[PDB]
Structures are given as C-alpha cells and as structure tokens.
Write a protein that binds this ligand. Structure first.
Ligand SMILES: CCOP(=O)(OCC)C(=Cc1cc(C(C)(C)C)c(O)c(C(C)(C)C)c1)P(=O)(OCC)OCC
Length: 279
C-alpha cells in the first residue's frame, strides 16, 4: 500500500545501508586495546566517574585462528583506570561514524542539500545513527554487542533492573524488544539524520519536509506490513524513542566533553563531529 515514491525511498535507504554498514566489522582493524599489566577539578572527576561507571563492558576478541582474547575492565579505584577502554571505544566509534557519514553521502536527498547543512546534520546525528546501527547487533539475552570478531558484554554489576537505569542501556533493550525490520531501522536512521532543528541548519524547511516524508513512509510501511495487535501504536512508539534518543545524544555528548576536559582522548573525526577545534 506504499506509493511508488515511498517504495523508491525505502529502496534508496536500504541500498545505502547495504553499501555502508559492514555488519561483520571485517574492516575494523588497527584499533587500540587496553594495556597489559583541588576542588573544582575534584568535582569534575566525581562527575566523570558517574558518567562512566554504569557503562562498563568487557571485551572479547576472537582470532581468525580460533584463539580468544578476553579483557575484564578494572574496578573504579579513584584513578585513571576508569579510562582504560576509552581509546579502544574511540576507535570503534570512529569506525562507525565513518560508516554513517558514508551512509548519508550516498542518499540522494542528503547529497542534494547544501554542503554546510550536510555537515550540520551529520554533526547533529552521528551518535544517534551509530547507536541505531549498534542496536541491530545487540543481543538482549546476553547484554552483548556482537561486532563480528569483537564482542562487548555489559558487566553483570545491581542486576538487570539496576542496569536499566542508564537511559542509553534502557534504550537498547527497549528498541530490541520492538523486533524491528531492517527497513524500519533504516527509516529511523533517516528520520534522525534529517532533523531540521540541529544547530547550524540553514535549509530548515527543506529538511523538515524531508523528515516528514520519511516519517510518513515509516507510518505507511508499518500499516501495510504489521496488522498484529502487538504492533498497534508501533509508529508512535518508534517516534517517541527517536525523541528520547536525541535527548540521550545531548547527554552523552556532555559526558564526552566532560571526559575530554580532564582526559583528552577523542580522535580527530570525533573532535570534528562533537565540536573540538584543537584550540
Ligand atoms: C557521545 C559520543 O559517544 P561515543 O561514541 O564515544 C566513544 C568513546 C560512546 C559510544 C558507545 C556507547 C555504548 C553504550 C552507551 C551503549 C554503553 C556502547 O555500548 C559502545 C560499544 C562500542 C561498546 C558498542 C560505544 P559513549 O556513549 O560510551 C563509551 C564509553 O561515550 C560517551 C563518552
């Protein structure tokens, strides 16, 4: 029951996703790994500890030869050990950000925007699109993001309910429970990417019209393909999660800048996307 334009729109988005989402992470290489073996500033450190303590994961690397490396992070002992996985995660996030920049650039609707708006939209949405792609490799039964030969497992710290307190973790579990199709994930990416109210966007009206068309396409897709009672209000649930994801983006951006202030680690691409000039 989709129009021809809506069908073409999903086709273009799915093409872009297929071309730019390395779901096996085969080309993620040469990344860093954790090493083997005042008053104003003290308040900053206390906040940064809170920014990180509920986001801890262990890391597993499965070798092509069948070997397995496993890393368990240190406990918070008041020192720099809370940062041990940040270079690695900066490298993974940077890899993902390159993929979502590539995703945007192959979409006609994005390519046709002024280059300054393209940059403003990617700066605005990079974390959101990255997390949406990460949700598709999230295993909610094991609390693990399965990234090809790499796995990131939430540290069983509190318990299951106490871990749902962290908004980005609650988001991953809640989104996984909706059991979305690839097409619904890629339309979520489009709706996030074409957000007319990101800082710096000049073509507000064009971007707003584009976003509405992606949202209408998603609404129509769901109506045409999901008649089951479980999917009543699914479109509205998804849109509400996209609004929540924008809020989480702002909050994790604040965490990033707080950490960067006392412990610089952002890669050059992260600096460009999240507003760090190099002073
Ligand atoms: C705003 C920029 O954030 P960011 O890309 O930065 C890279 C360091 C970032 C990325 C990130 C976040 C999560 C949570 C939040 C779902 C736990 C992950 O599970 C993962 C992996 C790689 C393990 C799948 C990466 P951040 O939210 O979490 C990493 C600690 O970083 C905010 C400081």
């Amino acid at each position: 029951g989709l129009t021809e334009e809506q069908r073409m729109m999903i086709r273009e988005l799915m093409d872009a996703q297929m071309k730019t989402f390395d779901t096996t992470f085969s080309h993620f290489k040469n990344f860093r790994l954790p090493g083997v073996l005042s008053r104003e500033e003290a308040a900053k450190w206390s906040q940064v500890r809170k920014d990180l303590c509920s986001l801890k994961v262990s890391l597993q690397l499965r070798g092509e030869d069948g070997s397995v490396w496993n890393y368990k992070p240190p406990a918070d002992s008041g020192g720099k050990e809370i940062f041990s996985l940040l270079p690695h995660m900066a490298d993974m996030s940077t890899y993902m950000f390159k993929g979502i920049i590539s995703f945007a650039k192959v979409i006609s609707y994005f390519r046709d925007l002024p280059i300054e708006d393209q940059i403003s939209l990617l700066k605005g949405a990079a974390f959101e699109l990255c997390q949406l792609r990460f949700n598709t490799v999230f295993n909610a039964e094991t609390g693990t993001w399965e990234c090809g030969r790499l796995s990131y497992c939430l540290e069983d710290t509190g318990g299951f309910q106490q871990l749902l307190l962290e908004p980005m973790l609650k988001f991953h579990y809640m989104l996984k429970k909706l059991q979305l199709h690839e097409e619904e994930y890629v339309l979520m990416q489009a709706i996030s990417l074409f957000s007319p109210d990101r800082p710096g966007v000049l073509q507000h009206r064009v971007v707003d019209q584009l976003q509405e068309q992606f949202a209408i396409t998603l609404k129509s897709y769901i109506e045409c393909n999901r008649p089951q009672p479980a999917h009543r209000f699914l479109f509205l649930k998804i849109m509400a999660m996209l609004t929540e994801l924008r809020s989480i983006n702002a909050q994790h951006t604040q965490r990033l800048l707080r950490i960067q202030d006392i412990h610089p680690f952002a890669t050059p691409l992260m600096q460009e996307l999240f507003g760090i000039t190099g002073s």
